[PDB]
Symmetry: D3
Subunit: 251 residues, 6 copies
């Protein structure tokens, strides 16, 4: 019933949207497109809890799995989102095994984790048998965005209770001393990205990546990424508007 986990169990990757603009209308509209999930970015956006909550509902209604890229790897924040019906969590700046364990701790009820019990919205979706299936209903990915996370990749990938990792390639490029360019060709960054993917797959884990274009996303899917996001709502909208203006003004 988690649409991303269904993709994976059926041998296919998932393609997901990425929202930095608050509100329910575009969230539902994009969810109804051929995205398997839609990620709401609570880090690099003005989207707070009050605004994310109805967006989760709208995405679920539209027929994509609602995901959140959180502001921080904080257990209580993550738990509140889970209980509000976030069914995927992408936690930024997971740099060590212990930080990955902190992420895992939030995603599972005791004995596997320490998630606090009060599943307001998942109990409506899944019913009274939710507890037994709860861990499978949520996808959890630790972000790999720093030199330190790269160095600790195998120790992060060893953590039970996380599905895998999600590469933040602009932050990773910046931490490597390069420009935080979307969809970069910088050879060292491209190499590090491929390394993380290879390590994740060798560990039997999933790997995702953030993309700024459909063409780059196609390549990432071909390279074997399990979870590919493309492209941020604001960037797509701004580019579309610039083109409309150029067309109208005959430029």
């Amino acid at each position: 019933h988690n649409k991303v986990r269904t993709c994976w169990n059926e041998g296919r990757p998932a393609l997901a949207g990425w929202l930095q603009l608050p509100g329910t209308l575009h969230a539902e509209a994009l969810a109804r497109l051929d995205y398997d999930a839609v990620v709401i970015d609570m880090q690099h956006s003005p989207i707070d809890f009050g605004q994310v909550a109805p967006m989760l509902i709208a995405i679920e209604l539209g027929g994509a799995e609602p995901f959140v890229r959180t502001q921080v790897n904080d257990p209580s924040d993550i738990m509140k989102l889970l209980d509000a019906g976030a069914y995927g969590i992408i936690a930024p700046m997971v740099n060590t095994r212990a930080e990955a364990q902190t992420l895992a701790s939030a995603l599972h009820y005791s004995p596997r984790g320490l998630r606090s019990f009060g599943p307001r919205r998942p109990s409506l979706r899944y019913g009274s048998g939710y507890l037994a299936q709860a861990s499978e209903t949520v996808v959890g990915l630790a972000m790999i965005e720093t030199r330190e996370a790269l160095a600790n990749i195998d120790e992060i990938l060893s953590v039970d209770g996380i599905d895998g990792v999600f590469i933040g390639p602009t932050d990773l490029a910046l931490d490597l001393g390069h420009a935080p360019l979307v969809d970069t060709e910088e050879a060292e960054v491209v190499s590090a990205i491929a390394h993380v993917r290879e390590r994740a797959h060798a560990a039997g884990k999933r790997v995702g990546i953030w993309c700024g274009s459909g063409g780059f996303a196609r390549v990432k899917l071909a390279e074997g990424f399990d979870f590919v996001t493309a492209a941020p709502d604001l960037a797509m909208l701004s580019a579309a508007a610039r083109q409309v203006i150029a067309d109208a003004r005959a430029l």
Copy 2:
């Protein structure tokens, strides 16, 4: 210290404006910073209420376009509250008669020209001490022409001194004339009606605006001499962009 759309017109040039149906300030500012002279916030065919429009007006102004609003109804008190919150252009629906156009005009001007109530919370901050002496010029007012009746009454509507002109809604006009509600309709009867409105507006010395769903249609409308052209709704542009990103991502 000038309405950017009126400045376009004073230079003999049209204005090009954006069109928002998505609430929020971030895309509003981002689009205002583009080569749009104005950005219209649609409070009719959207979920944008007053609470959400208010910060959007601020964001558009900061971004450097003139904040406009297409209201849900031609109601004087709603329009006045928007003016005092820093809407500097008003596009009012269902202006089908001279009297309805007079009702629009009444809201846009202080006495004796109109009956606008006094308390210009935000325009006084933008324009400072010089505001009241130029208040009417700081606002653009356009009556929507979107029905058979408005088309029949176009000359009487255009005779109303206190409106800058009219704003055509082609899809609703098409639907009210018995045709499909197409985006950027080119239904022959609708095309003729639109051409008639443009001709009558310029005969009357008034401005004529038109809603567009694409850059290409906007280009034609600008070439046809329209004074105010909107293109294209944020939601439509975003949905089409996402559909294309998906198609490219999933391509062989």
Copy 3:
């Protein structure tokens, strides 16, 4: 891809609906998931404004009931904005005359049947490409009967083709007829008036709905042949539940 209330009616069955005066999405979804065919959001006798109703409509739809709204006033532009936000049933207050019923009908249907403005942001997402061809059937419209005058004019109100029928508000009817504003009033004159409205509605081939404050009163109204029965307000049910929990907790 169907209005759940109209489906009930097409099967010769009544619809039972919830009634919300508390803003927020969580109880809206929870109650929609119960054996309610619709959930009405009361925008009149509540603090629920447009900003708060919008996400509630989404939550009710997700929960699997038809989202309805009892508006604060029979105003076409307010009603249209709700339709485009995904309200699929409208209950409009103070429909006291045929002309007021025509005003309600005008908002619910695209031309030529009505004058509904085009921009179906959310219904187009729910219904997809097939929307416009079935748009009128996707919405239920009920005129409230809550005054002496509406009672006198019931046949003229029911003659309006573009409304599904009427919705009785017994407490306001009682108050306007000179009686106490009781929840689930059984004041003899009010009982007779309500029976008259039901008979006239069915004589006219129209639907008749009624607001209820309890499950027991709703059961009787269903047995009397009402087509749409609401029971009972979230706030009233919650307050009564809490009072009983307290009494049980503090008992000897």
Copy 4:
């Protein structure tokens, strides 16, 4: 269990009220705790919408002043929704004729005295079981006098039984009479008009209120026998205070 303004009047004393154009509950409560009998929330010349006014009413009540609202328009349904949200005084704009005053009165009283719709969500909590039997007395209603026409029609407006009296807006009156829209205007023709309204109100046994922009002007209006005096807007007081703090901070 009493309207604090009506209690002032029953003691033969005027009421002094605050005036808020800034949304939010914290200053609303803080100002209500001062020696104001009421605090008026301005929903016209402010960005305060229903969503934001609702918690402010609660905060003012907690602070110990009577919550009042100056509405954006004299619309019965808007007024009723505010009453049911715990507005206990209504100041309605643009009451220019007897019929408009009757429209205000209609919203403030249950049948048979008016047509107020029944569902007193918050007044029932404040007043308890005794509410309905005293409902009309719990609310104060004032028709705004802010135009030449209202001035001409003052006696007919004051003849309407279901309003407590009138509320003068001097700046708008000045502007509509052809003068500058000054805060606390003392333009001779305006001064005479205001004196006339006060005299006619007391001749009719009605209450007369007036908006003030300063404590000094309010003091004079109280001395002239006004029954309800507001002073001064939160925004204006705050901006002037900040300007003076800056001047003191930057002084030699």
Copy 5:
């Protein structure tokens, strides 16, 4: 003037409501019933700071003491709630003495704690003499919800500056390997609950518990609990609606 502390000082327990639904109208309505306090749940609900703030006002107006069960035992979050007029704090997942000390630190101004000074709403309620009485105006309870908290109960109860503990019995049952059933009869959970109560009372501290029914709440009051909550708004409303539907449909 804190209505719960008045109950206690007068030899009686307090009975409190429990809100998971945001908004002011039911909050005031329930506060006007015979509840001494109303707890707003910011953990297992969609209630964020923006929505809790007016609810505190509404509860105070209705004549109950406004309490908050916070999302997390975080000092700065708690301080902001205190300054917004939360007059009771129930902090989840207090598992160690040090965590209880962190809770206490937020509830008292220096020298007793480190609460930052800027009491926007308490200064309106209490006036300029607020500082001298501030500690008494707030009730603070550490939640006992885990095996670890049970094990550390005496060390938690030793912390000056907290009034006592509040049992979270569904989380406690789950952490003990049982079902997170409301008002459970499971013998080990029932025993652990009684143990915490006994230890708290022996330490001269207060003990509260969360309940899902009036009948269970009656028993808890009889057993000597000082602070008893019953029952969550959403659960009461859902149950009421199900009964109305069954009655209407003749089922």
Copy 6:
């Protein structure tokens, strides 16, 4: 382009407003007065992220630099505010060198700090060359509010990446065992304030202070403070209303 840094570079202090009331209208109105910056207080106020976000826009439009005094010295909170267009950060309760380093870490992109990249609003203000100038576009001040911070002042002032310190004199007075009086004359508090200023200036750093009146602010400017705030909106408004009432009532 940061108006405060321009003041400093031009040899003048900055005078700033201080908002505890949410909303955009007074924020813009005060920004248009002769304030160089306006600080939004997210600690001792009901202002959450959802309400601060439009206020930043309004202050920038009005022509003052938007600053925020955060609820807590938390890196991810600070980063989200920076990306929403907060161009000054005042972080409360910075008591140790390590806490000051945590503040600095949030204010600078790698390699100087660890700020995560996604500058939604600064990229609109500054354009694609933002990264190279990003550190200069933001002013960062650590608050000195406790005996511990006083004791550690030189170690705090040694931290690269913070501009200096901001004295919270009411909390400081309280932590010293005195009354939390605004603009206090208490000799020990006055001495400690002067000490912090002197140490900051000797270290080549900036020093700010919170004031409750224009007269005290004038003295602070004369004493050499680089960043002086005066006075809180709510306090100014309440005092103004009391005076209007006294005038009206002839008292």
